[PDB]
């Protein structure tokens, strides 16, 4: 499978999540995603084929994970935007007020702005600290998906938000949306990963 930010993958033939970013760890290929998407060793599938398993994760507390893929996967420095792509150029962290977009299997490609940093989400499982808040909308299934600037700087992976009864926060005004992502920097250093760029 071609690994692109934003595409769907399933975990143990049950839940669905979205790919974050293609990364490498020495010769091993992988992608970063959300911790709440699977437990260590869960099996990730892309279009019905096995692509890898969860190598590590932290959830709750943080919300992060990396899946190590088999050798046959093709890692790409891109994030889906409809039929087009956003090239990943790096991981400079943008500041409050910067515009940002996110890509995921449920709501596609949505943009908005970063409204706050260091936010805590109280999930049923426990608190998740240090999240950055943006107002791009997100829906159930978007978790783990890419958060990136139009200029190609990777910001993080989708964690959660105030989804309404329709499964998303796209039907409420930007001013009332709280869509949270986990910062990419600490995931890259914690696992010793390098981003695939182009």
């Amino acid at each position: 499978a071609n690994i692109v930010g934003g595409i769907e993958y399933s975990i143990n033939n049950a839940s669905l999540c979205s790919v974050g970013f293609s990364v490498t760890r020495g010769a091993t290929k992988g992608f970063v995603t959300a911790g709440h998407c699977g437990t260590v060793n869960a099996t990730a599938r892309i279009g019905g084929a096995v692509v890898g398993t969860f190598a590590a994760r932290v959830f709750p507390g943080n919300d992060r994970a990396w899946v190590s893929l088999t050798s046959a996967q093709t890692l790409l420095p891109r994030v889906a935007n409809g039929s087009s792509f956003v090239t990943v150029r790096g991981s400079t962290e943008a500041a409050v007020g910067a515009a940002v977009c996110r890509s995921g299997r449920t709501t596609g490609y949505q943009c908005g702005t970063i409204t706050a940093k260091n936010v805590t989400a109280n999930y049923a499982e426990g608190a998740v600290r240090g999240l950055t808040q943006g107002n791009a909308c997100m829906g159930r299934g978007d978790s783990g998906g890419s958060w990136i600037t139009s200029a190609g700087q990777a910001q993080g992976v989708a964690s959660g938000g105030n989804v309404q009864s329709n499964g998303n926060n796209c039907g409420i005004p930007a001013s009332q949306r709280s869509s949270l992502f986990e910062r990419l920097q600490p995931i890259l250093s914690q696992y010793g990963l390098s981003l695939v760029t182009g």
Partner: peptide, 4 residues
């Protein structure tokens, strides 16, 4: 908020 909820996870996703």
């Amino acid at each position: 908020a909820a996870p996703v």
